[PDB]
Amino acid sequence: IKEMIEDFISKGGLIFTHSGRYTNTNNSCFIFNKNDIGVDTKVDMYTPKSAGIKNEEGENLWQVLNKANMFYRIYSGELGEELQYLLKSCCTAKEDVTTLPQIYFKNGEGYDILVPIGNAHNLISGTEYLWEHKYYNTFTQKLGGSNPQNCTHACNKMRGGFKQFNCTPPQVE
RNA sequence: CUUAAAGAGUCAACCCUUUGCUUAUCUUCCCUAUUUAAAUGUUAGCAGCCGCAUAGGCU
């Protein structure tokens, strides 16, 4: 693990639980919110042109950190400060508002500008929960186009694409 | 003051060749239709032409 984490910090080195990369690939906005991360929550991963080194079985950094709270046992801190501090040096905040939706909300006596950006856990728990447990009403999408590995490593890993729900009500006869 | 802002999805096609549905069969017995109505409304133009008839008249 140490050599490819060192390769990651020598690379671009960004981990995130929230992004706008899924809305448009020209996003480059990245924030790791802290209080929403629970034991089964999942996190995606970006480095430039989705590069990396395998762990001698074709295994990159993602399923490593994703597999059953692997990240948690370094985040809670039972693996020592030596790995935990180098992990914490990667989760930085990167701000960008270009080519993103920018909407308003009525707050108390006034309006507030805010940018909707996507969630990390929702896509991966969607691919692993509407699929395995027999929900038979969904749309399968692939982002991006013929080269989907431009966004993230989550984008890179599965090429079947994520799943949304159908929002089609039954209609009047 | 909207996941606000925005975008050509276009094209082409031989499905088709062949076929034994056959063999019989008990529907079957019993019954109160019935009793009283205004056809209202025809109050609708016909054998007709005296008639350029699509304007106006007479038996």
UniProtKB/TrEMBL annotation:
<protein>
    <submittedName>
        <fullName>Uncharacterized protein</fullName>
    </submittedName>
</protein>
